[PDB]
Symmetry: D3
Subunit: 157 residues, 6 copies
């Protein structure tokens, strides 16, 4: 009954995210990846595409499932009877903002946030920077799971 | 005749902001909360009311709106000190950059003070965002602002 | 079945550490508080006793002394996770370096959690230094500790 | 033979950027200032002209426009190093992320240099914003720029 | 009757420190530089002289030595405000931790102010270290301190 | 005539240091590694040992040489007619102190400091942390050059 939610926009999911999912999956009895959607801001990928990319890359994790949602993250967490958020840290993370949100989320809902640093190899990739580099021809193939690289280049072209 | 100006957009004013207002009022003879317009969720006119309502008990504090440079606002009132609050998530490096620029162009000092731990994670933006999605931020805002923020959404 | 190790010198344990312990105990099936030693104010056994009393209502947390590599203490108890608290003044860059080292050499993960705002400025060293010079740090330490501390200053 | 690229939007160039240019020009055989574009206050050619005039006494520095990946602009000119300045408010974490990305995808190194204290609080954006509202930022910009800037506010 | 205390070891006092002294004196009615002993390179008695010499032109500033808690020093003089300077290399996270502790145990506010860019990289330790190895730090220390620091080495 | 000094105690040299040496060597016409010695603080390795470990690991760099020194770094730099310092950045670097020293060094001697981040793989090793981990049996072999690992274990035993 131990469990955590891993939230984000995942547009697209990166190997930095995957690294965090795997560590969460190894340490909690269940993990729910929360694909949080802004209903007014279209991303590069649809919810279906975002969810499929994550599923294809997490198939070896039997205790991880993927769901989309919107609104307050702590409502998503508590609706599933959970009380924990696992958030990844990378180079360029706005950690001070993450801390402010962690304190806010604990205050309004009693939900705890656990931060874990992604591996050095995956520490400089982010969804936005990966899309930017790929838009101008840069090779980001080593920084994204296989379910993503193709689809990304397709969107761009 | 010491004095300081406490600037911000106060959209709306939080308990973090009030805490800073209070400390400034207890350490300077005269304090002027500067509501620098730039709309937002509130009109300038009602940002001011909410601050005045939450600070009616501070005799030596008063609230005005401003436009243009903050340093002109401060100096056209014969002062040269700014008091800014620090919370979790404050972009303090940008604050330092503005502090040095402001001292350079006008000789105005900036004093930073940490807000109380209890209000260290509330910010105007975050409180609005949580309150829109239906979370309770009543412990983080003055009662003057709370019932008013709700009525401006619901 | 899940578990984490909460390591530290806990000289003495603070309410900040206890906050972390409680959150780990609430999430993981098993928590082990590892009292890793170096010279301090309290002996290992004194530190352990103080933690045990502070965590009396946490049935799934136990306290042990440790020596050697932290990752050895962790993997020898069949676990693979460390939970470390964050406060004002923590030195997070060093923590990150240690977390990446510990992952590299042993596959052990480190999860960080921010202690509550009320407990975010107490550290063992600062509480001792304040108590030393006659400051009241009772509200920052568990009741068990405050007596045993002041009773060691004499 | 040695060389570096100094990239940026330089809208407009500041004395902070010029400090960096001079230090790069003093160390490397060849420096190329890359004016990488996006909408701003000055056109690319206007930016380039302003940099050329500011760097008139640097015979081994030239200025070119760029589009596409920065690392492409660098490796196409036969170089493999970027020199970036640091000031108060820089966002060094983002710079580090970009530096590690640029090394990963192209083998290009990034060297960072702190601008001199006198020039450490000016940024293009802040100087424009201050000038906009009638602040004197003449001492923070090259003489060539101060005129062309104020002559654009009108 | 406003007032603030400016604490430190001042071993020796730098131009960074003086800059803060001056700003505090221009914004509070009364200022007390607190030289908190803990020896070092100087005796407390001569740390005080060097400060008094460099601040003879500040009428509303005076210098005393203290021991024990800084908050007792401040409050046993009927004040409740501390003014601390910020430079490049200030451990500001520890400063924040002390600021919150000090507010908690005694209700004393801490105001931080950035020192002028020109003195932003001098610190007592670093100036001593450079001056021992024979580098010129005369532009970073008051002339009262300079000739005196030399004579205490050579 | 372009040149830089790479300073440190190098007790022992790490792969993080080596990474920085290589980048400095690639970008400047000459590099001098300055092994700065505190004459009152003995380290784990003698100056000879520190210098040999660096030399054995930098043999493929024809424009790099190694020298020891003490006192002011800027005197070391300027005595060799150079005007540049290249300093590596890693996880845990006291960057604010490095900046203070950079500004101080520019002020008193006109010497410029260029900072470069070591590769992610070598970003969490430091001389002190490597000695500590090795003291308690931890495997740091992947984080140090071959000229170091043996000698280190020898010192410890
Ligand atoms: C109003 C504010 C303090 C920002 O406050 P905020 O962080 O609450 O939004 C800042 O934008 C400001 O000073 N505006 C006035 C224009 C100005 O002075 N610009 C020069 C800054 S150095
Ligand atoms: C005990 C501690 C966790 C630090 O605890 P502390 O910050 O509370 O004093 C750390 O020093 C430690 O891990 N000691 C065990 C030796 C070790 O594992 N060294 C390798 C660190 S990567
Ligand atoms: C132009 C710049 C250096 C930023 O410059 P700026 O901070 O002065 O605006 C950066 O945006 C850039 O590199 N643009 C080129 C596109 C690119 O290379 N993206 C990959 C970055 S890892
Ligand atoms: C003297 C000082 C301000 C440190 O100043 P420094 O940074 O110049 O060395 C600090 O050590 C201090 O406050 N000493 C008095 C003892 C005390 O008050 N301890 C509790 C701090 S919360």
């Amino acid at each position: 009954m131990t469990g955590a939610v891993c939230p984000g926009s995942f547009d697209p999911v990166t190997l930095g995210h995957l690294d965090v999912f795997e560590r969460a999956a190894a340490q909690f009895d269940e993990v729910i990846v929360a694909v949080l959607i802004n209903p007014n801001k279209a991303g590069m990928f649809t919810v279906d595409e975002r969810i499929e990319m994550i599923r294809e890359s997490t198939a070896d994790l039997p205790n991880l499932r993927v769901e989309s949602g919107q609104g307050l993250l702590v409502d998503f967490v508590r609706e599933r009877g959970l009380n924990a958020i696992v958030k990844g840290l990378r180079t360029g993370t706005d950690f001070e903002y993450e801390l402010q949100m962690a304190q806010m989320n604990k205050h309004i809902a009693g939900v705890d946030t656990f931060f874990v640093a992604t591996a050095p190899a995956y520490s400089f990739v982010s969804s936005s920077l990966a899309k930017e580099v790929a838009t101008y021809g840069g090779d980001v193939s080593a920084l994204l799971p296989a379910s993503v690289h193709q689809r990304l280049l397709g969107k761009l072209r």
